[PDB]
């Protein structure tokens, strides 16, 4: 395994061990999971706090002391902390670049100082995606999440078909290609129903996708495609949760920053310290309550929506 993917091999290896002659999903994790984590958090202040946690863990590494928490019964002296530091470094790099894209540092801290600028309220530099203007970005991020899910599931189905070709498993290769054909048919139907512009060839694409799906249904001689194409459609559409958790966290952080700014504005000279105190305690409380899902969702999107496509659990 390459050195840049070895820390994430620990992330994937908690599940079943892949059989001999099957593709291992280890290299997908370093490219996709920190990417999704960065897109979810998208906060420079949160990235800095995670960097502080990472340098604390690196201090634990260089002192060579075990990290023992009696409450959680967790013991990992050198190497698990080293791999966790590597994973956190990738995660905070993606978080920093996505926070740059979103124009968010500790929420809406750009309200006090116009460093980042919307076109209506300009600053020194513009914001590519506000992500708090839900009217101007909902479609722009729903389509991005849908495209990411389609790419992931299509890659999984292509890997399934390739494994079926490798192992001469006809009922397996036909299963993969039938899922792919049904998926392109459903995608063409959705595009025709929602955003149709060129319905001429799109109907033919729908027809050939359904034809491939039905042909693989009869050829594979397995009748589980009919209720499971619903599940593959749900797996494609389940990547909306990236933008969903990202918008929820960003709006919560912006609301904490906004109530802090309002408290500072009302009390004036004496309200700066109190507003900073309440904003800080709310920020660490919200992070303590909701930070774990921020890694849980991007890693589960690889755990179930991606691994089940190529038979990781069989």
């Amino acid at each position: 395994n390459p050195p840049w993917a070895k820390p994430f091999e620990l992330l994937v290896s908690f599940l079943n061990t892949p059989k001999y002659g099957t593709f291992d999903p280890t290299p997908v994790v370093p490219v996709f999971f920190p990417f999704w984590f960065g897109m979810i958090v998208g906060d420079i202040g949160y990235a800095l706090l995670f960097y502080l946690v990472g340098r604390w863990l690196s201090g634990y590494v260089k002192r060579n002391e075990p990290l023992v928490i009696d409450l959680f019964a967790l013991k990992l002296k050198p190497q698990v902390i080293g791999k966790l530091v590597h994973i956190l470094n990738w995660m905070v790099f993606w978080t920093v670049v996505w926070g740059v894209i979103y124009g968010e540092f500790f929420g809406t801290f750009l309200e006090h100082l116009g460093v980042f600028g919307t076109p209506e309220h300009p600053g020194l530099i513009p914001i590519l995606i506000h992500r708090i203007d839900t009217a101007k970005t909902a479609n722009l991020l729903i389509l991005l999440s849908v495209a990411f899910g389609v790419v992931l599931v299509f890659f999984g189905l292509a890997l399934r078909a390739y494994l079926g070709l490798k192992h001469r498993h006809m009922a397996h290769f036909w299963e993969g290609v039938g899922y792919l054909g049904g998926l392109v048919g459903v995608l063409a139907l959705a595009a025709s129903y929602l955003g149709n512009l060129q319905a001429g060839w799109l109907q033919g694409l729908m027809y050939l996708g359904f034809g491939v799906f039905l042909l693989a249904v009869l050829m594979s001689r397995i009748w589980l495609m009919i209720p499971e194409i619903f599940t593959q459609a749900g797996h494609i559409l389940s990547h909306i949760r990236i933008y969903a958790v990202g918008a929820a966290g960003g709006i919560l952080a912006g609301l904490l920053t906004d109530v802090g700014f309002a408290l500072a504005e009302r009390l004036g000279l004496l309200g700066v310290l109190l507003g900073l105190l309440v904003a800080g305690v709310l920020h660490l409380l919200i992070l303590l309550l909701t930070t774990l899902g921020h890694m849980l969702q991007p890693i589960r999107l690889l755990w179930v929506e991606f691994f089940t496509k190529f038979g990781f659990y069989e």
Binding site: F14, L194, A233, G234, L237, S238, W303, F312, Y313
Partner: protein, 73 residues
Amino acid sequence: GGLDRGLIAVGMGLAVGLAALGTGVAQARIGAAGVGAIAEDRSNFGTALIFLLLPETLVIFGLLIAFILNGRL
């Protein structure tokens, strides 16, 4: 008139909320059984997770209906 916008919003809220309620109702028992199986064997992680996260399609398609209603706004 704002009657159409308001009642479409009510409809999509009802759809996504009741879909989430059904998904949670399923996931309660499925996740309890999965946690028991994990505590017993620890080799049941793939099957337990697959059974637990399978009924999320209900809330996914409730979200889909809500998005179509947003388009109808």
